[PDB]
Amino acid sequence: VPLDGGRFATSDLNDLYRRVINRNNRLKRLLDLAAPDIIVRNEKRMLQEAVDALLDNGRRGRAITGSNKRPLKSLADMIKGKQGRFRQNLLGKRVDYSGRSVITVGPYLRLHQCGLPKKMALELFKPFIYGKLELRGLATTIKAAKKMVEREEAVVWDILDEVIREHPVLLNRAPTLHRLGIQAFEPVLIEGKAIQLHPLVCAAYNADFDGDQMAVHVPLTLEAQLEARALMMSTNNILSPANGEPIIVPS
């Protein structure tokens, strides 16, 4: 790929591949000169080393190195390890319709609802707002709806209050040790930039209010909404799955 400033960024594989071709070509050339067998054998050993480094580097001797002084990454290294396909990208992707912020108390809430900033909810629920705007005739096209939300007109906030009405959002705190580390709440639009978390839930998350943060996800499909409402809501999870005891104890 080209980067800014007329400078390129490349993968290591290219490098490795080139090696092979170069040496391979030389071999085909050398056999046409009927060269002494010592040279051809040396070239064949080098070709074997090149292919082995391409397939799995740093396993049949020393690892080839780049213009830096760290070893190249081969086909085998692109699959294994915690920083590899399986671990990092097949189980553990990054996600759209997600945000994060700092959590505060909000002791006035009911167990099934949370406080969500207006500025965050206007971003997570953007396609829903476009749909509402163009369905109610406030916007002639999707471009007009984009303009209206960008300017933050008055009707945008009413459409937002109408879109968030009964639509759960999943809150999650980073060390998800058990399944009560993800829970679904009903948003309540607030000012500011901090999420408000019901006190009685804090023990489930293991959360205090001295700098912790939470991630919020919004379920899209109808089935995801019904699963959030029926399986993951906070008013269904009041007993611990490790033992039958309540986990909504006042602290």
């Binding site: 049949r60 001797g61 020393r62």
Partner: peptide, 10 residues
């Protein structure tokens, strides 16, 4: 040994 260069030298 494992170095191709070592074997070539030998």
């Amino acid at each position: 040994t494992t170095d191709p260069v070592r074997m070539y030298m030998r």
